[PDB]
């Protein structure tokens, strides 16, 4: 555990910059691949397209980032009906026994790269229906999850916190530098 720095210490530190991979990497090819990766992650963290999925009550909150108080289209985020035209599936609601192959098929038909936001307590770990017969204990055991939005109804502030943390995860996602070091 570390805390946020004091303003004198914060004035001592320099600016972080946009690039999470640093300014220089002591090679021309490494710098070129890092800047290409920065451009690619800027194009990917800008306008992730979530999927019209909406299993349950947490979905009603999902329209409160559609609703003009929070405005998910300001961030590039915009809903698409088909899973082929989507980067993100927001698994939000109760995942039951009949929806296990449905969610697995919709996730598998969605093309790479794939990031899944788990919104709500039922999608995280079953929640208030954890000890029931029909509810799958979270959506981790069927599909991978990158972001766990924790509130049962999350505030749309807390859902866009998960969306912005997904954007920061895509911003730190590195593939071309990995290709150079593989």
């Amino acid at each position: 555990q570390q805390t946020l720095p004091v303003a004198e210490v914060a004035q001592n530190l320099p600016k972080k910059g946009y690039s999470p991979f640093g300014t220089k990497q002591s090679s021309v090819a490494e710098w070129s691949l890092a800047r290409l990766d920065d451009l690619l992650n800027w194009g990917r963290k800008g306008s992730i397209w979530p999927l019209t999925f909406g299993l349950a009550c947490c979905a009603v909150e999902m329209m409160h980032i559609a609703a003009p108080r929070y405005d998910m289209d300001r961030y590039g985020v915009v809903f698409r009906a088909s899973p082929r035209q989507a980067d993100v599936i927001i698994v939000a609601g109760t995942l039951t026994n009949k929806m296990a192959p449905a969610l697995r098929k919709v996730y598998d038909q969605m093309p790479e790269p794939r990031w899944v936001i788990s919104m709500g307590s039922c999608a995280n770990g079953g929640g208030y229906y954890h000890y029931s017969y029909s509810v799958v204990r979270g959506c981790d055991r069927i599909i991978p999850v990158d972001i766990y939005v924790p509130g049962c109804p999350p505030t749309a502030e807390a859902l866009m916190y998960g969306v912005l943390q997904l954007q920061k995860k895509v911003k730190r996602m590195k593939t071309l530098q990995m290709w150079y070091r593989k």
Partner: protein
Amino acid sequence: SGPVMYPDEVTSLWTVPPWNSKVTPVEKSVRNLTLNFGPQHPAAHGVLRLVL
């Protein structure tokens, strides 16, 4: 009374045409297209499977 005057080997297996010239078409079974408004469909509200 045959289909023809002189039945050959191929021809004699035929039947007589009906004396009424009108032959009504039969009613055959039809299998329609099975499309489901599944759960991903936005008109199906997320968790409805209409097997239309």
